[PDB]
């Protein structure tokens, strides 16, 4: 019946935390925002698939209030000269949005890769543990 009213959803997924943030198609207006660390207590759980899932539900609720129906997803890790694998939690944000009623448009990996780069932290020997 109804047309598909679309929003953008950005997802950042590092080793330490996950950040979820919905915007208009222009990226220049913000509709809702949450993080894993907002909902959980212990610092070691901010990357947890569970904390990501709790934080996604709050964002899904506010979007349903503002009257949105469909979503495009752009997802990333940290990149630059650092790690460029998508962290834990990133792939549970997406599955949660699908259990909520939302129709999924398109998914894209938008991690910032460098053609060559500045020097990384850690010294010539690296972390010793």
């Amino acid at each position: 019946e109804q047309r598909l009213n679309f929003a953008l959803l950005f997802i950042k997924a590092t080793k330490n935390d996950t950040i979820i943030h919905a915007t208009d198609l222009t990226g220049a207006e913000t509709l809702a925002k949450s993080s894993g660390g907002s909902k959980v207590k212990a610092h070691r759980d901010e990357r947890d698939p569970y904390a990501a899932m709790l934080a996604t539900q709050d964002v899904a609720a506010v979007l349903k209030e503002k009257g949105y129906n469909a979503v495009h997803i752009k997802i990333r890790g940290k990149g630059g000269n650092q790690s460029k694998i998508i962290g834990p939690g990133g792939s549970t944000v997406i599955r949660t949005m699908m259990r909520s009623e939302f129709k999924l448009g398109r998914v894209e990996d938008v991690t910032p890769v460098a053609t060559d780069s500045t020097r990384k932290k850690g010294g010539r020997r690296g972390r010793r543990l």
Binding site: F6, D24, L25, T26, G27, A28, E29, K66, R106, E108, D109, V110
Partner: protein, 204 residues
């Protein structure tokens, strides 16, 4: 104090494609048309070719970018601002045992806009042949690259943007390159990789 209540939606419109209207954007309500211009003009968005055309599901690998230019009532009108291939396509294309050929060139539209174009091609391993790799010799790569630049100059230099956009849609430059350069060596995956707007002329 629910600021969200106090916002005006406007519809985004585009040209030289089969689909005219693509979505809508918010702003806080304002008294003066001069303010609304200064708030909306300068914004940008991107759309996949598969969303703004009726087409084979294969053509999803390309994105177009548009910049807000003008306001009329409910509608914001937006103009061409570049082209880009999707990350999955770029990363999936590169393979071990083959050579990449790459180029950068600058061109000028009749309208006066200056564009910068990035191009890619890959070598191909012939059939009925048993060597593991099909690398291209360094001097031969310079022959291909020299040819690519005259093809881009012939196709796009001194044209209108209405003409350029349809050439990009139909992928004519890739097709021409594969035809023309076959005499030097066999090639595959010939594509325009990115188009970037460098200078726009001071106009009213």
């Amino acid at each position: 104090k629910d600021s969200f209540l106090k916002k005006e939606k406007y519809n985004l419109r585009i040209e030289n494609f089969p689909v005219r209207e693509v979505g809508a954007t918010l702003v806080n309500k304002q008294s003066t048309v001069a303010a609304l211009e200064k708030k909306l003009v300068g914004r940008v968005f991107e759309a996949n070719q598969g969303d703004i055309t009726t087409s084979d599901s294969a053509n999803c690998y390309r994105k177009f970018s548009f910049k807000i230019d003008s306001l009329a009532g409910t509608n914001a009108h937006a103009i061409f601002n570049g082209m880009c291939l999707t990350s999955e396509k770029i990363k999936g294309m590169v393979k071990r045992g083959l050579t990449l050929i790459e180029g950068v060139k600058d061109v000028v539209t009749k309208e006066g806009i200056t564009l910068r174009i990035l191009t890619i091609a890959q070598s191909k391993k012939e059939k009925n042949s048993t060597k593991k790799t099909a690398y291209a010799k360094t001097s031969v790569v310079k022959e291909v690259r020299k040819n690519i630049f005259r093809i881009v100059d012939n196709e796009l230099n001194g044209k209108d943007i209405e003409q350029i956009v349809k050439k990009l849609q139909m992928e004519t430059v890739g097709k021409e390159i594969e035809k023309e350069c076959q005499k030097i060596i066999p090639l595959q995956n010939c594509h325009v990789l990115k188009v970037k707007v460098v200078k726009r002329p001071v106009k009213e």
